[model samples]
Target: GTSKLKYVLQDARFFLIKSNNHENVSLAKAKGVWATLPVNEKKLNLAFRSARSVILIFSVRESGKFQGFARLSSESHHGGSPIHWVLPAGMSAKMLGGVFKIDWICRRELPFTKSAHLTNPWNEHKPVKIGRDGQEIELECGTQLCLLFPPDESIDLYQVIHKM
Candidate 1:
């Protein structure tokens, strides 16, 4: 089996309703980031119509190897959660066929966004850890509103699967 792939969320965007009525709508017409939920604050539920489709742009690589882009699919509430697939260390799309699916996986509950209130202490940017229930590690700062991975760590993000 190939080594686990490590990656960090570079950019995440919420697009317009993926429903049939708005499926043709461009990303420009969609809501950007989480602004205000109106009723609730703690519960940042940004659902539109049916399954919520999100765009997750990330950088990935195996330990000690170079990095590349892995633009994965969105996870709908109807569909299951995102999963990781181990692929060959290369940029070619054909290389994706060399996948060795693994049990290890990780995902962001919320995308990293800019602090609305820079004055607020908690709102201030800080390194967030991504790990399983028991094991966790602090990530380094890379891009603004970004998720980072340590050179020693192995991580991967995948799209949610649907049950038909």
Candidate 2:
């Protein structure tokens, strides 16, 4: 019988990129991903490594005023995967403005592996090192920028999965 593997959200990483309206922002070096076109030009194309998943939030502004925003995600462990999103066309002007910004967030999933346990450091005998599956994971909120959108507005969300 085929069984699906449900992975627990172990750890996560975050990134961001800003483009001057209509221009592409290459985050290959910063976040190992890239984006193409303005929000309304063509479907927004984002690329990233499959080892991790990415969540991107885009905000549009014109003349220093917020206009609109959109959210998208990319998750695949098979190397490079392309993610796409279609932003509202009514905000074209602001989408191309210099004030445009993108807030990116990433979530990393731990793959299934053979269960193993390690001895405590204080053990007199040979103490085994913890495997990647036993590594300490944490989330830090300080020193990071957060965004808040108006009521009745929200971004889209996606999930990545694996099998048992």
**What overall lDDT, based on C-alpha atoms, would model 2 receive against the true structure?**
0.26
Error of 2 at 10 (Å): 8.0
Model 1 over residues 39-138: C-alpha lDDT tens digits? 2211113322222222222212112111211222322122122222222234233322222111212222222223121121222433222211111111
Clash count for candidate 1 is 1
* Global fold similarity of model 2 (TM-score): 0.26
Whole-model lDDT, candidate 1?
Answer: 0.22
Candidate 2 C-alpha lDDT tens digits along 1-164 = 01111121223322222333422322321233334334322222222232233233222222122222222234222223432323335534333332212332222211112111323232232212221211211212200111222322122122234210
Residue 121 miss distance in model 1 (angstroms):
14
Best by TM-score: 2
TM-score of each: 0.19, 0.26
The lDDT for every candidate, in the order shown, is 0.22, 0.26
Candidate RMSDs in order: 17.9, 16.6
Model 2 bad stretches (over 4 Å): 1-10, 22-52, 59-72, 75-144, 151-164
The runs of at least 3 residues in candidate 1 whose Cα sits more than 4 Å from the true structure, single-residue gaps closed, are 1-11, 14-72, 79-142, 147-152, 156-164
